[PDB]
């Protein structure tokens, strides 16, 4: 059983450990020579993965049982070549293509599915912008298809590309991790507990699990998460990005790769997002049981700093090279778990 | 920060992962070419580890910050020289020597310390080869129990932590079965901590120690201690917040530890087809660790040890 990982960054390494515990040989592919998953993989490969010819030869020679796309820098055309009884793609070349095309994924979510999003318009003129502002009002979020905030410049109520978004009030950003595998009885679709996340003080990301939601908010979230994921199809672990304001839930995005916010799961769930995606790739049963509330801080290791960081109760750390590290804590409550993680991170950075 | 592992087998691999999560480069040393920790280590080394000359040159050239002895086939004479000259040993050489000398460890436990053991005699009943030959009186036993003792430094100096007792026994098809926690009476648990703590402090140094005991209601007997992660410790990979390997990674490096339990659990060490895993991972709260030339660990957790053992039985059965 041979799995091939397109991408060899930090989560590619943990996934590779996970897959090796379950008995699989892993090939780690990337562009440069010293990539993280190269060090512990069974076989390392260097190719400009953004090269449809060069990538496709590599896949034909090695001929892996499973082809896992863990990065965004990849030839989607090369992947559809391989799809077009020798290798299962997990995720599908469909999902890889849909989620790298930002325009097409929004239009898939809001138009084909009836998913609720923040009002958005794709323009291609100045005049197109002019209308939207008159129609939509302020503030707007003009973004290339950096992201400027058009916060200023209809007489009656009955009245390349650049993306315009109306701005909505938001309480929480939330990551819904959806897992699609096979069980001993066929297809499984599992939901993790909502993961709350946000940008923190020193340019770090903070996450925590579980984020509490109302019944109506949680029903909406499962519904939205489940529907975008079934449209993509195939086995895999999907991170579905949502915006929440009390009862309202908005679709923002989905990634076929383990999000930075998922790092909390390494300590807060029985099976981490990496153990889940190892099992999903290989078509094995999964559950989404939680160990305990937790929080994480992704920073972007002096001997003194480590000693101090691990002095914080129920804490853990994942050191990764230059400027990359994860601070982790668990606790009987999310609030304690976030305070401990901020302590771990503070003693570390 | 560079740790060197004497021994490169399956537990040496998990310890190596653990140490790499905490930021350390690991050198895996063993006798043969394809050893398990070689595959994911940062640097691999092949040497005859019982050769004091050959081993000692290897340690002098590489010059690691920490020297960890994970196997028993190692030159203790080569090891004592490293403590006499740049490099911290976890575990310490005193411990490596005492626990490989079976006669001297018994005499240390029963004579110098006043530890209770089964009556024993060395001559020159359970007659066993120790030359000398060891004679033991046979006592009634309820449970075999592993007491995992952890010695590290915290942010406030020395720590000595006890894990929850691990029960273990030989089960069917040659599998070793373990489970955590094993319930003990107050008097039994007081005895066990006392015995575990006393043999470990006599060895000294940082490390993770497995202390073997025999239990019959009230009475606790010392049977053995190892400076290496016992096969019965495998249950901790899922039953404790920090597995025996994460604890020994933290102990080697002198970091704080705790011994919190996630949930009751059980394990079965067997000594791997796709349908075997599909069927095996269908058991609730189950996990597997595949190695090896047939080596595998079946794991389950549950709200009760009894369910956790039945699930692990099932996982192992669907796997074997």
Numbering used by the authors:
A (entry chain A): 27 to 110, 114 to 174, 181 to 188, 199 to 204, 212 to 352, 365 to 413
B (entry chain B): 27 to 111, 115 to 153, 169 to 174, 212 to 352, 365 to 413
Sentences from the paper on this structure:
Glycinamide-RNase-transformylase T (PurT) is found only in some specific bacteria including Mtb and utilizes ATP-dependent ligation to catalyze the formylation of 5′-phosphoribosyl-glycinamide (GAR) in the third reaction of the de novo purine salvage pathway. Structural comparisons of MtbPurT using DALI Server indicated that it was structurally similar to the ATP-grasp fold proteins with their characteristic three domains, and thus MtbPurT is categorized as a member of the ATP-grasp superfamily as in the previous studies. According to the MtbPurT structure, the monomer of MtbPurT consists of a small lid domain and a large α/β domain. The B-domain forms a flexible lid and covers the active site for ATP binding.
The MtbPurT crystal diffracted at 2.79 Å resolution at the SSRF and belonged to a space group P3121. There were two MtbPurT molecules in the asymmetric unit. Therefore, the MtbPurT protein exists as a dimer in solution. The final structure of MtbPurT is well ordered, and electron densities for all residues were clearly interpretable, except in four parts (residues 111–113, 175–180, 189–198 and 205–215). In contrast to phBCCPPurT, loop 252–255 between β11 and β12 in MtbPurT shifted by 13.1 Å away from the cofactor binding site. This structural rearrangement in apo-MtbPurT represents an “open” conformation. As a result, the pocket of MtbPurT for the cofactor binding has a much broader opening with a width of 11.6 Å (distance between Ser182 and Asp251) than 7.3 Å (distance between Ser172 and Asp239) for phBCCPPurT. And MtbPurT recognizes ATPγS with a relatively low binding affinity, with the Kd value of 207.41 ± 8.02 μM. All four mutants (R131A, E217A, S218A and V220A) lost their ATP-binding capability, indicating essential roles for these residues in binding with ATP. In particular, loop 383–389 in MtbPurT is much shorter than that in EcPurT (loop 352–364) and shifted 5.7 Å away from the phosphate of the GAR substrate; thus, no hydrogen bonds with GAR were found.
